[PDB]
């Protein structure tokens, strides 16, 4: 139900200061982070203004970083320079629900939330590739050396 | 010998935990971070182990983040999906000494050291697309301005 | 393959100039200090030359002195005419966790980083006795008229 | 590091201490004893870690290189500003290219140390910039007879 006009991040921020981004509709949204809460200033027209959110793009600019909560439902993870992995979170456990390419080597511990490229459709980092179609069945990812099938939890929790 | 190993980063880190990476020479380097300091562990073969340094790669794994000292000489700023700028620092001012392409749009204010792609030869991000020859002979656009000029929101 | 390199100092120096020394593997290293920073030049053989570090032997030469950072773990303090004491440093507090001989006479104010003969395996001063084996258990050191056990803080140092 | 001028580690004639500077601009020193040169360098200059010695208008000392005759291509200054490439075949030499057409040439290929370059590696100082790299449809003048691009050095049996 988001019209992008891209889906903004709304949550805590790392650092204090003034942030600057441009939406896909054209808006320039300005953010004022102080004590880790950002106050948004934007045009009635952008959905992000309505949602209190702040889209992240090649256009983003300022000293601050997203500090999202660990209770996401899906996370796209940049593993190669051009390859990603979809993690699904269920309880305190995270399971590889998909991957751009097969035999995709990957780390075994899950990262802190702010290293993920996208959380539930929301971008976290100013630059990244596009995302090849996430294969979700009939596949395997290598973790170091021992391979696993799709759906299988990350081996370190 | 010394020659193929990536010039690693040595300095303060953000967040505690265990860092993993692989040097171009093939060596694996491990960094243990507590209170911002990283202790380096690696094979004798590799420079970074002797240098106390950590090579940031597409191979780097971990929770910690580099926190560079603001007192650099030169820095690489990724200002576009595929475009960079060399920023040279003199005292409290910084002067844009290079650019991969002429007339690239630019930001009027320098970022925190940590947002720079490379510092004095040390790459700080793990994913960084390659840098075409830097041009030091044209102009940039913030208005529009010749090479060597300070950052226009630094006057 | 692996040189027996006695590890060098890398850090800030006192007094600009040109310094020469010989390494344990007989690499005539030479350094150039300007504004505290020394730039090293030697052979691709020595492993100080992989770290970029200056070995301090009794071979060193020149008007510069090391100025080490204060956050060491273990230091070597030269007492006497032939005796040392390993000082172990925990945060702001300092313990006499070794010695080269029992019941050593031993001052109780722990010196500036500059004054230690060796800091965490790096010598700082050109001339030194060879260190005897470090007795670390069932021994004591005298701070003046008082006698204390191995593992004790310094007796000037405010320890609670 | 990658900007450094490829130097020479081979045998030297004479003994003593040699100085020169790289294009990177760390200076270099070689110590020659029994014909072997030891490289003392800045922990910045590839020629130090390569044990090589960059030969430049900046070199000084009392010693002269002696390359082994098992080179591939070489540079031969035949005039004040005119060189000639020479390809070794495992046999006897071949003139692989000039810098100017109808160039005059001595028929005997000289000992390895008279060449300005052996394989992209300078051996002499003050040698003039090479021009172009010309390959074909051109002739050289050995004695009074003339020869095509590609022929053996005449005086070789
Ligand atoms: Zn919008
Ligand atoms: Zn290495
Ligand atoms: Zn050595
Ligand atoms: Zn060089």
Numbering used by the authors:
A (entry chain B): 6 to 162
B (entry chain A): 6 to 142, 144 to 148, 151 to 163
C (entry chain D): 6 to 165
D (entry chain C): 7 to 163
Publication text:
Our crystals of domain 1 from genotype 1a NS5A show a new crystal form, and allowed structural determination via X-ray crystallography to a resolution of 3.5 Å. The crystal structure consists of four monomers of the genotype 1a NS5A-D1 arranged into T-shaped asymmetric units, which are juxtaposed to form large solvent channels; the crystals have a Matthews coefficient of 4.73 Å3/Dalton and a solvent content of 73.97%.34 Similar surfaces of the molecule are exposed to the solvent as in the most recent 1b NS5A Domain 1 dimer crystal structure. The zinc-binding motif has the same coordination as the genotype 1b NS5A Domain 1 with an average distance of 2.24 Å between coordinating sulphurs and the zinc atom. The arrangement and proximity of residues Cys 142 and Cys 190 in our model and the presence of electron density in between the residues suggests the formation of a disulphide bridge, despite the presence of DTT in the crystallization buffer, with a distance between the sulfur atoms of 2.0 Å, 2.0 Å, 2.0 Å, and 2.5 Å in monomers A, B, C, and D, respectively. Monomers A and B of our structure are related by a twofold axis (179.9°) perpendicular to their length. Dimer AB displays a similar interface to that previously reported, but one of the monomer's orientation is reversed creating a head-to-tail conformation [Fig. 3(A)], rather than head-to-head. The contact surfaces are formed by residues 74 to 78 and 83 to 84. Residues 74 to 78 from each molecule appear to form an intermolecular anti-parallel β-sheet through an extension of β-strand B3 from Val 75 to Arg 78 [Fig. 4(B)]. The monomers of dimer CD have adjacent N-termini and this dimer could represent a potential target of the compound. By combining the different conformations of the new NS5A-D1 dimers present in our crystal structure, one can envisage an array of NS5A molecules that forms a more expansive network that could interact with the membranous web.
